Structure formats: C-alpha cells, structure tokens
Design a protein around this ligand. Sequence first.
Ligand SMILES: CCCC(=O)N[C@H]1CCOC1=O
Ligand SMILES: CCCC(=O)N[C@H]1CCOC1=O
Ligand SMILES: [Fe+3]
Ligand SMILES: [Fe+3]
Ligand SMILES: [Mn+2]
Ligand SMILES: [Mn+2]
Lengths: 319, 319
Amino acid sequence: EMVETVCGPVPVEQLGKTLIHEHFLFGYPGFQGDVTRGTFREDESLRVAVEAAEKMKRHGIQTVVDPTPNDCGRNPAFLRRVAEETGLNIICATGYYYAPPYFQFRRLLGTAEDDIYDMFMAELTEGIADTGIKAGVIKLASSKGRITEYEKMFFRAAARAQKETGAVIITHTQEGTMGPEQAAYLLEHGADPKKIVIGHMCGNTDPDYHRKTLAYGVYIAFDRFGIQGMVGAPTDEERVRTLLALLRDGYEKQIMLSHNTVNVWLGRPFTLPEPFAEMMKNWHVEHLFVNIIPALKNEGIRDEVLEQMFIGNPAALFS
Amino acid sequence: EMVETVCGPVPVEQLGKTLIHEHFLFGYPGFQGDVTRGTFREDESLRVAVEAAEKMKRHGIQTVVDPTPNDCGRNPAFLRRVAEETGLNIICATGYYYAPPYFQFRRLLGTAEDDIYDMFMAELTEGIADTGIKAGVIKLASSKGRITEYEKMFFRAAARAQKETGAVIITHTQEGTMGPEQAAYLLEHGADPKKIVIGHMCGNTDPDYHRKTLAYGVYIAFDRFGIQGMVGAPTDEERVRTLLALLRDGYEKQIMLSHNTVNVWLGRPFTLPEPFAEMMKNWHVEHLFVNIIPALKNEGIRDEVLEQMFIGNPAALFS
Ligand SMILES: CCCC(=O)N[C@H]1CCOC1=O
Ligand SMILES: CCCC(=O)N[C@H]1CCOC1=O
Ligand SMILES: [Fe+3]
Ligand SMILES: [Fe+3]
Ligand SMILES: [Mn+2]
Ligand SMILES: [Mn+2]
C-alpha cells in the first residue's frame, strides 16, 4: 500500500515511472576529510540537483530511488528540498558503501551485527538522524568474487530487518560477480525474493549468470547505463545485447533499468582525463530515454515491456 | 616565535607544560554512517571535554596537541570553545587516519599527491573549512611492517609542506614498526628532523629500535600511557622500563610523553568488556601525573629531566 519517501508515506500506486538507482549527491567515503578544498555549496548543489530532477520529469519520471549510502553523503533533508521543489517522489536508503575502522572496532566488541540491524531498523521505522525522514530501502554490497564475513554481517542484519519491516533490499555487486550468491545468502536468511534487487547486473555479459540469478525469483538491475571504460564496466552496446537476450526470454517482470548518475559530486571537484571523458559522455539522467530505449524499440521491444520495467516492476517491488 | 593554535598564533614561549597527544573528540572513520544511533550531543560533549581540560590544568598542563585526523571528527570550532572555556592552548592537525575510496579515486586521476599537499598547505596557512582556524601539525601514519606507496604520497606531501611552512610533523607507527623507516623517508624528502615526532614509539619494547630511530635526530613519543590489555600489546610497566633505559642513556631532549586519550567518542556509545575494561582503567588524562611520573621519580628521574620532556621539548619542537 505505502512506501516511505523523503516526504513521508506515499501510496505505491502513485510511484508511477521510476528510476531505481540515481544519486543526487554522492561522495566516496573519505570525501569528508577534504572539506577545506571540497566544501559543499548548498545553493549551487540544490540548483544542479533540481535541474537533474526536472530533466527526469521531462521524460515522465515521477519517482527516483536514491540509494546513496550513509557514509557517502546521504542527505535526507537535502533530498526533501529537491522533492519539494520538483514534485518528484524520492526514496532513500540505509546502508554502507562497498572493512572501515569503525566497524572493525565494533566487531571487536562483538556487537557489530546487532548494531547494524539496530541502525537499519531505526532508519526504516523511526527516522534518519533528527530529520524524521525514513529510508525505504536497505542498501548492501559485496566484494569481487566473494561475500566476506564482514559483508555477511550486513546481509544478515538486512535479512532480519527486511523480515520485520518488509523494506526493499538493493545490492551492489562488484564487477559482475556474486549475483547468485547474494540472492542465495539473503534467501537462506529468510529474505523475500520479491523484495530484493540484485544491482549492477549489467556488469556481467554472460546471460547464463543472469538466468542463474533470476532463478532465485529476485529482481535484477541494469543500473549503470552510460558508464563505459571505467571499472572495466562493459559498454552500453554490451548491456543492450545482454538485456535484449533476457527480454526475449520473457524475463521483463524481474528487470529494472537505471544510470547510477552522480549529479553532484561531494568533495574536491575533478575532471576526467580525455580518453575516459569521451567514453563517459552519455552518463546522464536522460540517456535511457534519448538513446537506450529507442534502440530497444528498433530491436522490437514493445511499450508494454518497457512499461513493465519502469512502472510495473517498481510498483510490485514496493508493494 | 609563534605557533598556530585553535585561538590563533601564540608565542611558543607561552606553550609551557604540554601534552603532545590527546583527543578531545575522536571517531573511527565510518562513525559518520552511524549518525542516527550515534548522534553528536554538543552540550554534553563540551561539558566532558572541558572537564578533561580542567583535570589537565590541575596538573599544570597549559597546552594540548590534539592531532585528531580530518576523517576522525576533527572539529576546530569545538576545540576553540574548549580553549575559550578553559584558557588551554590547543593545537590541531591536518591529516588522515591510519586507502579509503576517495583517495583511491584521486590516485586514478593521478592528482592525489598534489591534492594532499594542497590540503596540507591550505589548512596550515589559510584555515580549516571556513573556520579561519589553522592546523599547527601535519599528522601521518604508516602500516605494520611497511610504508605503502599510498602512505608515501602523504609522507612526500608532508615533507613538501613542512619545507614551505616549518610546520611540525607527528606520525603514528603501527604496533612498534617502521620508526626508523619513517624518519629516513621524511629526511630523504627534505623534512627537518627537529620538526618531526615519531609517535607510538612506546609500542616497541626493544631499546635498540628506539636508538635506531633516535639516531636520525627526530623526537619520539611514548604517547599511549594507560593503553593496555590487547594480547601481545605493551603494558605501562613495559613502557616505563623502556623509557627508563633511554633516559639513563641521556636521550631526554628527544622524548615526549602522552596518553592518547579519547575524551568523547564519536558515533554509537559502547562499553568495554570487564577484563579489558580493568586493564584500560588508567587510560585518562591524569594518569601520567598521578601514576607514571611518581614511579619515574622513585627510579631516580629528576625534575630537570621531566621538565625537559614536558616543557623544554615542546618549546624546541615548535620553535
Ligand atoms: C566514474 C565511475 C562511476 C562511478 O563513479 N560510480 C559511482 C556512482 C555511485 O556509486 C558509484 O560507485
Ligand atoms: C578501547 C581500546 C583502546 C582504543 O581504542 N584506543 C584508540 C583510541 C584512540 O586511538 C586509539 O588507538
Ligand atoms: Fe550507486
Ligand atoms: Fe591518537
Ligand atoms: Mn553502486
Ligand atoms: Mn594514532
């Protein structure tokens, strides 16, 4: 019936057309230390965030899931201002970026898993900090080729919180690995497959890997459209090829699409070197609508299917 | 002549009796993510910080160096309130805690070392964030048994900044390793030995290691008095034994003492288990004065020598 947004509970039937994964603000953990030369400018950042939101609305987007982790500059009050300014629904997350010393220490104390669970529960059902704003998703990540014991604590805490709240879990997979293992581990700890999104699945170009992941009944996200040439992320050409194969296999009810944009970078400004700058030129919130979707239609993907991915799937995911 | 404190430039001759290493606030990197259950309470934190300062002033302490790193909750405006409240001089640092994603990324961009140098220079000569408060020390750290290439970037940036500003460098060594290598690397990049403090040297109990470090002409700090209880980690009894040997070798002009206290922990509150708790029971700002110093005097250490360590050495270090 309802889902927690940065503006409070909203009927799931009102979410409409949704981008499952985009960042209004993002900083890599550590950006905090570089505050002097990387100061946050609120007015300019809000202006940029709002322009990005208006671009999305132009393409009919009504809802954005912004899963910026707790240590990556997640700012619920800022996201509420963006929502208030634009009428967009924005759903935020609780979780940590892809071990940090704070949690090495609580592991020592032996309280880490319970502390993480308590954190998830507080942010899902009480509010983040003193904002009164609640997260609607739990964000998780694992390592390349392995789900470490550290990471499993988070997975276990997430499974517990998911069982109590019915919140959605969104994961990050590293370099196209551990999709099946993520789903299996969550399910083995009681998590609901219909409330799980295995993310960055576009990082793998082997359809068998996807089918193995999809067999668990979870959602999967091709959530990095526009990102090419870095991380050894595949090309958009490769993403589309993989997507087309799955869609022609009838998997549209388990697939969602996004760009993983960072519209305002936190910390010190930078500029990408010339070779990558060009490969990364389509990495913006309009890319799916101006480039990818028309290419899909040319390959015979019907509106029905597209609507299922952008509207049907988020509705079912959050209900 | 002058040193930058959180209240601005102060004559070095007014520093007087000094604790070279104590934290008013500290959180392990990652504490930021746990804001909801680990909210910073300003009034209570200030009250606790000020009480700690007043305990130090009771033992004649007039200056504290608080080298809390940039990513560990360093809060110059807070430290200035403590100083204003108590009359203490407080000198803060610029540096990162003992590679986080932010700097892995700038390493990719190839600008990391220059960025770190720029950061040091800005914080030493302009001010931290918008506070107008300048650091007086550069804080550095290396790994157990190795100074990594990542860490060496910081060391190189620090050496450059030190040559330009004459600022002091304070290091963290991990588990009694790399003292000599730290001094050698800094000196090889032009840093001034009389402006360097190799920290946590109390972590090693082999006097030859200390003498090898001292041979470079740097200061060394026994800066963790009261910290005891980890298996294989040094006891206060062991610290005193090592210290006594060096003092009887005539090294008092290169040695400084501290506790490395954390008076207010940032992030979620915790309680140490009963056994470790009892071992850690002397970890407070009065410990050197009520326990360690009287024990030194019983072993024949004269006031002259103690005065050199607590007053003479910091004066020479910062001048
Ligand atoms: C430029 C490389 C791509 C990138 O920065 N991805 C970021 C976006 C948010 O989560 C990530 O890891
Ligand atoms: C409670 C155990 C001791 C401990 O955590 N010391 C910490 C505090 C400051 O930097 C240290 O290394
Ligand atoms: Fe992301
Ligand atoms: Fe310290
Ligand atoms: Mn991601
Ligand atoms: Mn340290």
